[PDB]
Amino acid sequence: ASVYAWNRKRISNCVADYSVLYNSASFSTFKCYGVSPTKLNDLCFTNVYA
Amino acid sequence: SALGKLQDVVNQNAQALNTLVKQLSSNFGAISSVLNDILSRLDPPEAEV
């Protein structure tokens, strides 16, 4: 999507493996706020929005 | 009410303890009042704050 009309994907009822994304060599930026990028797989959320 | 003088002492101390305990639920500016939640989410460099 264009940034003025960004696309929101709602994610729920699933297993979220964030190490696949974090340990990827294909991303130039991966900045986490309010949470450690290496503790994500130990956490549970009520929803994730992408 | 005859023994109010003794009951008042009991009430004041019970109240003081209840208040002290309730303060543990305050954030004081932190992301959470729960120490375990902070530690489970953040790494030391940020958890410390």
Side-chain angles (χ1 to χ4, degrees), chain A, chain B residues 2-49:
Chain A
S2 301
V3 71
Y4 89 94
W6 46 275
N7 184 33
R8 169 161 283 189
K9 167 72 174 180
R10 186 194 289 269
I11 297 169
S12 65
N13 297 308
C14 58
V15 179
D17 187 344
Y18 296 99
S19 291
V20 172
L21 297 171
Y22 183 66
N23 292 329
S24 171
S26 298
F27 302 120
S28 66
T29 300
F30 202 119
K31 295 181 181 179
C32 295
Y33 305 87
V35 65
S36 167
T38 60
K39 294 191 175 184
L40 290 169
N41 281 354
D42 289 334
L43 302 174
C44 292
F45 305 112
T46 60
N47 207 274
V48 179
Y49 301 91
Chain B
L3 275 68
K5 288 180 178 178
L6 298 176
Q7 188 63 50
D8 285 339
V9 173
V10 172
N11 290 343
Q12 287 172 348
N13 286 278
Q15 184 178 61
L17 288 170
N18 287 339
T19 300
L20 179 64
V21 171
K22 287 177 182 179
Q23 288 298 100
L24 292 171
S25 299
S26 294
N27 287 336
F28 301 111
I31 60 171
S32 181
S33 69
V34 180
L35 186 58
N36 286 333
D37 288 344
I38 292 167
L39 291 168
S40 73
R41 286 167 57 174
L42 302 177
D43 288 329
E46 287 87 48
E48 174 170 356
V49 173

